[PDB]
Amino acid sequence: SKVFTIGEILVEIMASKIGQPFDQPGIWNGPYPSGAPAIFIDQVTRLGVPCGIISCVGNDGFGDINIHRLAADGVDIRGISVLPLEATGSAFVTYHNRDFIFNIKNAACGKLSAQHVDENILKDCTHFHIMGSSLFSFHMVDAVKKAVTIVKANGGVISFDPNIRKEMLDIPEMRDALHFVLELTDIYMPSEGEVLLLSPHSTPERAIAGFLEEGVKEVIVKRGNQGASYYSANEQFHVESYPVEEVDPTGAGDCFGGAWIACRQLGFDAHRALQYANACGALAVTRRGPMEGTSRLMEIETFIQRH
Amino acid sequence: LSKVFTIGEILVEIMASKIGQPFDQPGIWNGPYPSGAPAIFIDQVTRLGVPCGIISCVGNDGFGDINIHRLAADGVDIRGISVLPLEATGSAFVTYGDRDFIFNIKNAACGKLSAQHVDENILKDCTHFHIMGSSLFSFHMVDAVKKAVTIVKANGGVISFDPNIRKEMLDIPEMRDALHFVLELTDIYMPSEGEVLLLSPHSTPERAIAGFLEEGVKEVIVKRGNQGASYYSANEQFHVESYPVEEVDPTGAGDCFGGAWIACRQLGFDAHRALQYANACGALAVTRRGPMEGTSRLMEIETFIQRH
Numbered sequence: 001s002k003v004f005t006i007g008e009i010l011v012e013i014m015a016s017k018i019g020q021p022f023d024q025p026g027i028w029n030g031p032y033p034s035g036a037p038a039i040f041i042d043q044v045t046r047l048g049v050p051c052g053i054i055s056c057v058g059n060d061g062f063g064d065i066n067i068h069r070l071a072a073d074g075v076d077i078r079g080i081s082v083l084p085l086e087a088t089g090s091a092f093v094t095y096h097n098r099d100f101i102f103n104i105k106n107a108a109c110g111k112l113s114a115q116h117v118d119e120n121i122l123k124d125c126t127h128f129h130i131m132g133s134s135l136f137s138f139h140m141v142d143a144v145k146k147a148v149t150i151v152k153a154n155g156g157v158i159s160f161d162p163n164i165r166k167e168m169l170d171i172p173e174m175r176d177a178l179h180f181v182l183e184l185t186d187i188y189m190p191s192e193g194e195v196l197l198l199s200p201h202s203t204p205e206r207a208i209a210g211f212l213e214e215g216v217k218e219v220i221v222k223r224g225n226q227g228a229s230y231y232s233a234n235e236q237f238h239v240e241s242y243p244v245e246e247v248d249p250t251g252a253g254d255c256f257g258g259a260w261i262a263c264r265q266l267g268f269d270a271h272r273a274l275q276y277a278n279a280c281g282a283l284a285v286t287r288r289g290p291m292e293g294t295s296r297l298m299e300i301e302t303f304i305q306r307h
Numbered sequence: 308l309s310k311v312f313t314i315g316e317i318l319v320e321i322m323a324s325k326i327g328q329p330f331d332q333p334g335i336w337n338g339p340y341p342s343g344a345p346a347i348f349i350d351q352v353t354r355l356g357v358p359c360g361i362i363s364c365v366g367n368d369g370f371g372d373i374n375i376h377r378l379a380a381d382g383v384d385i386r387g388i389s390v391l392p393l394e395a396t397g398s399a400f401v402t403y404g405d406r407d408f409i410f411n412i413k414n415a416a417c418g419k420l421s422a423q424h425v426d427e428n429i430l431k432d433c434t435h436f437h438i439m440g441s442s443l444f445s446f447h448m449v450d451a452v453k454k455a456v457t458i459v460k461a462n463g464g465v466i467s468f469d470p471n472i473r474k475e476m477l478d479i480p481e482m483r484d485a486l487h488f489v490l491e492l493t494d495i496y497m498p499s500e501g502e503v504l505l506l507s508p509h510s511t512p513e514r515a516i517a518g519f520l521e522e523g524v525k526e527v528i529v530k531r532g533n534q535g536a537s538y539y540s541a542n543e544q545f546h547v548e549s550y551p552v553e554e555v556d557p558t559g560a561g562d563c564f565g566g567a568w569i570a571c572r573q574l575g576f577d578a579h580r581a582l583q584y585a586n587a588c589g590a591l592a593v594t595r596r597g598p599m600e601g602t603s604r605l606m607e608i609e610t611f612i613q614r615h
């Protein structure tokens with residue numbers, strides 16, 4: 001029983017100071033392993049659940065830091081193809097109080113396609129997770145479509161976190177790609193701000209009811225500093241947030257998701273899984289760095305206990 | 308009203324803060340810094356006071372802005388710099404003998420430069436057009452360059468060419484031809500010592516150079532790294548020794564040497580003066596870190612030469 005994801009893998013370069021602009025020489029920190037699917041799958045493995053990822057990186061040091069990190073953490077990296085003529089994706093980020101310069105679409109991670117999805121790699125996959133952020137081109141979609149149908153046809157469970165960029169919604173083809181995934185989704189994990197996106201219904205209550213009636217088995221709604229909710233035909237509950245000192249919210253959704261999926265793989269019931277997921281996301285935001293907020297079971301449990 | 312123009316890639320460079328710093332581990336980096344052979348060449352030209360412009364493409368981000376701001380502030384005509392919303396401004400990560408790089412040019416805004424992104428209303432007063440071989444990495448680039456060249460030669464302009472190519476391009480017949488194509492329309496050839504035989508059928512520099520001149524090239528300026536440079540014309544031939552300096556970054560040496568030569572010639576310097584100034588410029592260039600941070604003003608070169 002293995003958990004698999006697919007998508008962009010990149011390195012993040014972070015500005016050394018708040019307010020630091022992009023158009024002035026300065027000091028930066030990095031590279032740091034990154035990319036929503038990678039963060040998610042890193043959290044899954046740190047919780048002791050077998051998993052793998054399908055992506056494309058370039059034949060360079062930036063691709064290496066990612067492969068090395070995931071591999072050392074227990075992730076099956078056979079699915080990460082290395083592209084000699086492409087540069088590994090990157091993202092420069094600066095703060096205020098947030099701002100980015102992305103090289104994802106036209107980078108190695110954007111070369112992912114059906115040809116780079118090895119069906120044999122998914123032969124024993126029981127759960128496949130999709131990040132909406134990965135659907136930014138026809139090839140990304142073809143890759144996702146191929147992997148999802150292989151797993152679904154093999155009786156696997158599909159989970160989907162629509163962490164998309166609102167822009168993609170104005171693009172029919174991407175809008176249709178998102179509808180595709182949802183149509184085959186068992187576990188839908190939108191944040192409150194994303195609940196209405198892929199629904200013909202205008203009120204959240206109505207949208208969620210719609211997802212269930214359409215085929216989804218469970219809807220997990222992330223509410224940031226307000227906690228999280230769980231919805232199924234069988235039950236419905238909510239958990240309050242754990243008050244923490246937020247530093248970086250960029251990996252909260254990814255970690256919360258990996259925790260939910262991993263805990264469920266470990267046999268946790270909905271209530272316990274939601275509690276751990278909630279605590280995992282809270283812990284993630286207390287540290288800077290994309291993948292620096294993932295936690296292991298012991299840390300999550302101690303955090304819960306202390307509260 | 309007479310202007311020197313160039314065309315090509317504009318990118319930013321992000322440098323490793325320490326020697327021995329790997330790309331596969333977190334650390335500290337310095338940047339972004341304005342870069343790109345054509346950009347450094349043109350920055351040296353404008354710093355010498357010679358009116359100039361550049362045709363290039365950058366993305367709609369801060370990395371694109373730092374280059375436009377620097378060039379504009381230095382006096383370069385940047386109207387030929389198009390901003391592409393759907394693309395990312397090229398970049399280059401480097402770390403320290405070898406420099407080691409991670410490039411994003413071919414698939415960035417740089418490689419989007421199209422023959423249409425050129426014009427001619429922009430090159431109307433261009434009497435000198437300079438080409439960097441490092442820019443010819445796609446048929447779209449060669450097209451943009453071919454168009455610009457036709458336009459400039461139509462108004463009776465002069466073409467200068469610096470073959471700072473990646474030897475690899477020589478095995479791709481298409482690019483191999485683009486380069487030979489440009490060479491046949493070149494008036495001023497400026498290969499480095501290790502690039503002299505590349506576009507030549509001969510195997511000895513003497514022969515290679517004698518061939519370029521026979522074919523039509525009027526001047527061949529050979530850069531010899533830390534051993535000076537040589538000038539070759541059908542009528543004369545001479546060389547200058549290198550100035551001893553504490554080298555720190557060789558990245559922009561050739562580009563600065565090039566801008567200095569072209570600009571000094573525009574200011575009426577004879578071949579002998581221009582060669583010593585270009586030579587000194589390249590010498591000064593390598594003393595500071597950063598691709599475009601070593602350019603010099605005319606009198607800085609003058610004093611450099613004097614003092615010594």
Ligand SMILES: Nc1ncnc2c1ncn2[C@@H]1O[C@H](COP(=O)(O)OP(=O)(O)OP(=O)(O)O)[C@@H](O)[C@H]1O
Pocket residue numbers: 163190191192221222223224225226227228241242243244246249250251252253254256277278279280281282285
């Ligand atoms: N400031 C916070 N304090 C406590 N818990 C938080 C905070 N922010 C997030 N969380 C926890 O993490 C889960 C992850 O959440 P968030 O709602 O930011 O994810 P998301 O909406 O998917 O965002 P993303 O755009 O990064 O994918 C939340 O539902 C919550 O349980």
Ligand SMILES: Nc1ncnc2c1ncn2[C@@H]1O[C@H](COP(=O)(O)OP(=O)(O)OP(=O)(O)O)[C@@H](O)[C@H]1O
Pocket residue numbers: 471498499500529530531532533534535536549550551552554557558559560561562564585586587588589590593
């Ligand atoms: N270490 C050095 N010491 C003194 N002068 C130097 C040094 N390096 C370069 N120069 C001067 O600068 C000119 C610029 O030279 P270099 O040979 O590195 O350029 P190039 O071979 O064209 O390289 P590129 O590919 O960067 O364009 C030289 O011919 C020389 O006069």
Ligand SMILES: [Mg+2]
Pocket residue numbers: 172173174176
């Ligand atoms: Mg379509």
Ligand SMILES: [Mg+2]
Pocket residue numbers: 191253
């Ligand atoms: Mg969110």
Ligand SMILES: [Mg+2]
Pocket residue numbers: 499561
């Ligand atoms: Mg050289």
